[PDB]
Amino acid sequence: RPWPASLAALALDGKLRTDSNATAAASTDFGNITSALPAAVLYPSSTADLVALLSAANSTPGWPYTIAFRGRGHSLMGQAFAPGGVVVNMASLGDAAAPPRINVSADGRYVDAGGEQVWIDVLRASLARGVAPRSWTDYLYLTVGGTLSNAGISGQAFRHGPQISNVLEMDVITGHGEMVTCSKQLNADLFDAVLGGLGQFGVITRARIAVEPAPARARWVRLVYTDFAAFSADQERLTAPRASFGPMSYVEGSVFVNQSLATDLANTGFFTDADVARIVALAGERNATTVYSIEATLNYDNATAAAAAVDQELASVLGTLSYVEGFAFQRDVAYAAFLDRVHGEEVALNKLGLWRVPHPWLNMFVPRSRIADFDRGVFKGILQGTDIVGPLIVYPLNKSMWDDGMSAATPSEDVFYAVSLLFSSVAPNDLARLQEQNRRILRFCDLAGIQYKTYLARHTDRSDWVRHFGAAKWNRFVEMKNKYDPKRLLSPGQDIFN
Ligand SMILES: *Cc1cc2c(cc1C)nc1c(=O)[nH]c(=O)nc-1n2C[C@H](O)[C@H](O)[C@H](O)COP(=O)(O)OP(=O)(O)OC[C@H]1O[C@@H](n2cnc3c(N)ncnc32)[C@H](O)[C@@H]1O
Ligand SMILES: *[C@@H]1O[C@H](CO)[C@@H](O[C@@H]2O[C@H](CO)[C@@H](O)[C@H](O)[C@H]2NC(C)=O)[C@H](O)[C@H]1NC(C)=O
Ligand SMILES: *[C@@H]1O[C@H](CO)[C@@H](O[C@@H]2O[C@H](CO)[C@@H](O)[C@H](O)[C@H]2NC(C)=O)[C@H](O)[C@H]1NC(C)=O
Ligand SMILES: COc1cccc(Nc2ncnc3[nH]cnc23)c1
Ligand SMILES: *[C@@H]1O[C@H](CO)[C@@H](O)[C@H](O)[C@H]1NC(C)=O
Ligand SMILES: *[C@@H]1O[C@H](CO)[C@@H](O)[C@H](O)[C@H]1NC(C)=O
Ligand SMILES: *[C@@H]1O[C@H](CO)[C@@H](O)[C@H](O)[C@H]1NC(C)=O
């Protein structure tokens, strides 16, 4: 039970807190479905405090405290908790002013960012130097270390890969309490393990993130379909390799069920009421139970000719497509306004009291060969007759842009779809129904032989995690767990080794 000097110094300096206010704040997450109180919350003022805690953990025999690294707690099912353990309040690393926690490189080819930093601040500090990361998440108020522990995907991933494919190097403190810098060339085994590694191997204190010259504006389009075959064929055309890709900077898509079509179209924040009326009419003419929309952008800069060159490039692209004649809808915004588009959605929902609610989200990767089966079984099947609150996002990814040596698990096929069904619960009895429906969707997929992977989900059975990674890739994961977290204390809320 004796404490090392450096661990005791943290309690003395008021950094180790055991009060009910501190512990309660670190006991809930964005999922708002599960909770777990820690014994203590650490508020580090430097990476030395992290070394202190993890060295103590490693050297103290019989050490009982699991350790989690809370980013912004956007986890869905407790992945950032440490039940009866220590939660690290990562945000405390950026409390001061000296030194800065985000540094754009002198050559403008990368940005250095603290693990604790949120992507919105990474964006703001990048644009101040005329650059920006190439690969995003839909939502910018997430931490660098958090998204990198998962993958980080948005409409750019088809061409640039996920955020984990856009890291040059990291500083990481392992379960041993050892500060290690890692890359493809230095300590590559740790580098690959941590990326998509679900916080199992250590804490990312710094990430070196690839940037590109920052575009000024995004030409922003949505294309409407009643035929899934045409919708998916076009998403695949837009994202297909020609190493080289087509013009589009971003390609996502969405599914709208007929029952709430007008309301959901109106709630996109994209369509006007005039647009909505035309799409509702189209659905009725085609007798459609589902409507599909491709969402795409073309990034361009402040050049004088840029706007007309964009018009012509866009016109050419669209002429290769098969959306319903006349159902192309365009917007034109500043690039930062596009990237932070979901912030506005959060503000609106929270003011309605619809943000801090349970989020039984279903996120998965579905092989291209079975996407039409998934559409029939889920969008045209299971989901029909239900009231859906939250977007249903569907878009293809290219496996060639994913590094399978990293921890992140993906389907085997060259093309696979991100399917994100972002259900928001309107309290009882809606939550239990939504949890059951997600089970049924997974059940449908299992029975149809669809070889999907989950994303952002934590499994509670060993056989499920083994299947998740694949047996050979699982053994790799375990090898790296043994070297970097032998005491199995880190990120216990993933329920892999805890
Ligand atoms: C809330 C949410 C999440 C989200 C999103 C939109 C919203 C509203 N949009 C996403 C998107 O478009 N694309 C995508 O890939 N993910 C998207 N997300 C999910 C998001 O990536 C996850 O929630 C992720 O966990 C990031 O969230 P956060 O930064 O808040 O991290 P956390 O929940 O607290 O912890 C997650 C796990 O990672 C470990 N962790 C956290 N920080 C570190 C560091 N620095 N080093 C090592 N491990 C770390 C935690 O222990 C936990 O297990
Ligand atoms: C951002 O750059 C600053 C330098 O402008 C870095 O600060 C130095 O690095 C470490 C901080 O732990 C110390 O060894 C030096 O004394 C710091 N210099 C001073 C006094 O500012 C900082 O580490 C960088 N941040 C990241 C995460 O890249
Ligand atoms: C799409 O959804 C609407 C419901 O919003 C359906 O229209 C309804 O049809 C029923 C049965 O004839 C009528 O009783 C309702 O008055 C209609 N509702 C409204 C408000 O328009 C429509 O049938 C659905 N289409 C498909 C193909 O399922
Ligand atoms: C990995 O795919 C995901 C996972 C979680 C969230 C999202 N995106 C969004 N999450 C929340 N609100 C939104 N509005 C538009 N897109 C989103 C996308
Ligand atoms: C969910 O949020 C509500 C309201 O903000 C809160 O009272 C409750 O404790 C939360 N539940 C969990 C399990 O986090
Ligand atoms: C592009 O230039 C315009 C006009 O000079 C300016 O308003 C805008 O801030 C610039 N966009 C950036 C910083 O990318
Ligand atoms: C309209 O679609 C519904 C549901 O798919 C179907 O039952 C019905 O037969 C269709 N109507 C016609 C005339 O095709």
Tokens of 291: 């409507």
Q: Are residues 147 and 271 in the same domain?
A: no
Breaks (C-N over 2.5 A) in the chain follow: 242
The answer to whether 73 is a known ligand-binding residue is yes
Ligand 6 pocket mutation, candidates 302, 304, 332, 335, criterion most atoms within 8 A of CB: 302
Question: Per residue, what are the HEC states of the chain?
Answer: CCCCHHHHHHHHCCCEECCHHHHHHCCCCCCCCCCCCCCEEECCCCHHHHHHHHHHHHHCCCCCCCEEEECCCCCCCCCCCCCCCEEEEHHHHHCCCCCCCEEECCCCCEEEEECCCEHHHHHHHHHCCCEEECCCCCCCCCEHHHHHCCCCCCCCHHHHCCHHHCEEEEEEEECCCCEEEEECCCCHHHHHHHCCCCCCCEEEEEEEEEEEECCCEEEEEEEEECCHHHHHHHHHHHHCECCCECCCCEEEEEEEEHHHHHHHHHCCCCCCHHHHHHHHHHHHHHCCCEEEEEEEEEEECCCCCHHHHHHHHHHHHHCCCCCCCCCEEEEEEEHHHHHCHHHHHHHHHHHCCCCCCCCCCEEEEEEHHHHHHHHHHHHHHHCCCCCCCCCEEEEEEEHHHCCCCCCCCCCCCCEEEEEEECCCCCCCCHHHHHHHHHHHHHHHHHHHCCCCEECCCCCCCHHHHHHHHCHHHHHHHHHHHHHHCCCCCECHHHCCCC
Number of neighbouring beta carbons within 10 Å of residue 328:
16
User: What was the experiment behind these coordinates?
Assistant: X-ray
Q: How far apart are the first and last CA of the chain?
A: 23
Distance, in Å, from the CA atom of 36 to the CA atom of 155, rounded to the nearest integer, reads 34
Contact 150, 167 (CB under 8 A): no
Distance, in Å, from the CA atom of 201 to the CA atom of 195, rounded to the nearest integer, reads 10
Distances (CA, A) of 305 to 299, 302, 309, 310: 14, 9, 6, 9
Which residue CA neighbors atom 28 of ligand 3 most closely? Answer: 289
Q: Are residues 238 and 369 in the same domain?
A: yes
How many whole angstroms from 274 Cα to the centroid of ligand 4? 26
The answer to whether 268 is a known ligand-binding residue is no
Distances (CA, A) of 20 to 38, 40, 106: 10, 9, 45
Task: List the one residue out of 386, 389, 387, 293 whose CA is nearest residue 345.
Answer: 389
How many whole angstroms from 413 Cα to the centroid of ligand 4? 23
Tokens of 58: 């490693």
Query: Of 165, 191, 216, which closes a domain?
Result: 216
Q: Are residues 308 and 273 in the same domain?
A: yes
Q: Are residues 383 and 289 in the same domain?
A: yes
Place of tokens 């085997």: 412
Distances (CA, A) of 118 to 115, 144, 155, 289, 363: 8, 6, 19, 39, 22
Distance, in Å, from the CA atom of 91 to the CA atom of 69, rounded to the nearest integer, reads 10
Distances (CA, A) of 21 to 17, 84, 163, 274, 456: 9, 15, 34, 50, 28
Any atom of ligand 5 within 6 Å of the Cβ of 412:
no
Residues spanned by the domain of 236: 217-455
Sign, CA dihedral 325-328-329-331, equals negative
In CATH, what number is assigned to the domain containing residue 49? Answer: 3.30.43.10
Q: Are residues 345 and 380 in the same domain?
A: yes
Q: Are residues 324 and 461 in the same domain?
A: no
Distance, in Å, from the CA atom of 177 to the CA atom of 52, rounded to the nearest integer, reads 7
Task: List the one residue out of 101, 163, 114, 104 whose CA is nearest residue 134.
Answer: 163
Distance, in Å, from the CA atom of 423 to the CA atom of 21, rounded to the nearest integer, reads 30
Distances (CA, A) of 350 to 115, 170, 357: 27, 35, 9
Distance, in Å, from the CA atom of 455 to the CA atom of 407, rounded to the nearest integer, reads 12
Distance, in Å, from the CA atom of 137 to the CA atom of 135, rounded to the nearest integer, reads 7
Task: List the one residue out of 361, 397, 398, 381 whose CA is nearest residue 448.
Answer: 381
**For residue 426, which amino acid is it?**
V
Which amino acids are annotated catalytic?
74, 138, 252
Tokens of 471: 């047996």
Q: Are residues 173 and 302 in the same domain?
A: no
CA torsion angle 332 335 336 340 (round to 10)? 60
Q: Are residues 182 and 294 in the same domain?
A: no
* Total domains present in the chain: 3
Q: Are residues 289 and 389 in the same domain?
A: yes
The answer to whether 388 is a known ligand-binding residue is no
Distance, in Å, from the CA atom of 224 to the CA atom of 271, rounded to the nearest integer, reads 11
Residue 133, classified by CB atoms within 10 Å of its CB into exposed (0-12), middle (13-18) or buried (19+), is: buried
Q: Which residues contact 11 (CB under 8 A, 6 or more apart)?
A: 3
Tokens of 39: 């014994």
Distance, in Å, from the CA atom of 423 to the CA atom of 381, rounded to the nearest integer, reads 16
Ligand 6 binding pocket (C-beta < 6 A) is 214, 216, 302
**Nearest ligand, CA of residue 205?**
1
Any atom of ligand 2 within 6 Å of the Cβ of 208:
no
Tokens of 25: 């704040």
Contact 394, 418 (CB under 8 A): yes
Distance, in Å, from the CA atom of 7 to the CA atom of 57, rounded to the nearest integer, reads 9
Task: List the one residue out of 470, 420, 490 whose CA is nearest residue 194.
Answer: 490
Task: List the one residue out of 291, 358, 375 whose CA is nearest residue 327.
Answer: 291
Q: Is the peptide bond before 360 cis (omega within 30 degrees of 0)?
A: no
Contact 256, 231 (CB under 8 A): no
How many whole angstroms from 303 Cα to the centroid of ligand 6? 10
Distance, in Å, from the CA atom of 244 to the CA atom of 242, rounded to the nearest integer, reads 5
Q: Which residues contact 347 (CB under 8 A, 6 or more apart)?
A: none
Bridge partners of 181? 171
Distance, in Å, from the CA atom of 219 to the CA atom of 234, rounded to the nearest integer, reads 18
Contact 210, 305 (CB under 8 A): no
In CATH, what number is assigned to the domain containing residue 341? Answer: 3.40.462.10
Contact 82, 182 (CB under 8 A): no
Distance, in Å, from the CA atom of 57 to the CA atom of 72, rounded to the nearest integer, reads 24
Distance, in Å, from the CA atom of 400 to the CA atom of 161, rounded to the nearest integer, reads 8
Distance, in Å, from the CA atom of 171 to the CA atom of 207, rounded to the nearest integer, reads 7
- Structure resolution, Å: 1.9
Q: Are residues 253 and 185 in the same domain?
A: no
Ligand 3 binding pocket (C-beta < 6 A) is 258-259, 287, 289
Tokens of 314: 């866009």
Tokens of 374: 């998934």
Place of tokens 């932070």: 340
Bridge partners of 229? none
Distance, in Å, from the CA atom of 51 to the CA atom of 274, rounded to the nearest integer, reads 59
Number of neighbouring beta carbons within 10 Å of residue 176:
18
Q: Are residues 239 and 128 in the same domain?
A: no
Which residue CA neighbors atom 9 of ligand 7 most closely? Answer: 287
The CA-CA-CA angle for residues 161, 388, 28, to 5°, reads: 70
Atom of ligand 2 nearest to the CA of 171: 27
Q: Are residues 47 and 75 in the same domain?
A: yes
Place of tokens 């259900």: 423
How many whole angstroms from 284 Cα to the centroid of ligand 3? 9
Buried b (16+ CB within 10 A) or exposed e, 257-266: bbeebbebbe
